[PDB]
Amino acid sequence: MKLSQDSSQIELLKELMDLQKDMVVMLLSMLEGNVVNGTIGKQMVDMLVESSNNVEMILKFFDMFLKLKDLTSSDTFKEYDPDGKGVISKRDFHKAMESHKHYTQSETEFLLSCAETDENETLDYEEFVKRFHEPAKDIGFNVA
Secondary structure (H helix, E strand, O other): OOOOOOOOOOHHHHHHHHHHHHHHHHHHHHHHHOOOOOHHHHHHHHHHOOOHHHHHHHHHHHHHHHHHHHHHHHHHHHHOOOOOOOOOOOOHHHHHHHHHHOOOHHHHHHHHHHOOOOOOOOOEHHHHHHHHHOOOOOOHHHHH
């Protein structure tokens, strides 16, 4: 939640996401050799229910930063910046968001807050997706 908004905490976010990936790896190692309806799985799901809200908001984070490639590759997004650099105004990005309708108002707001903007509110969409989508799906495959 907090580090995604700022811009001087990219390395800290990367380290944290690697730590989360290792934690999920350990959980899968616990789930190794588990029969159907096992005690280990029961404790799995009891822990998840205990930490339901955090898991829910992490999953929202993941859906949020994984739909980016789907929206970015769209011709509707390509229209707003046919140039290769694709520097797109913040409210131009907002109009693309609203046209796609895949995001909501809150998702749009938080994504715009996370997306750094230049003097003309123009953000390099390629750099943004590289920064917020490759760690995505990579930490997320373990969760899936």
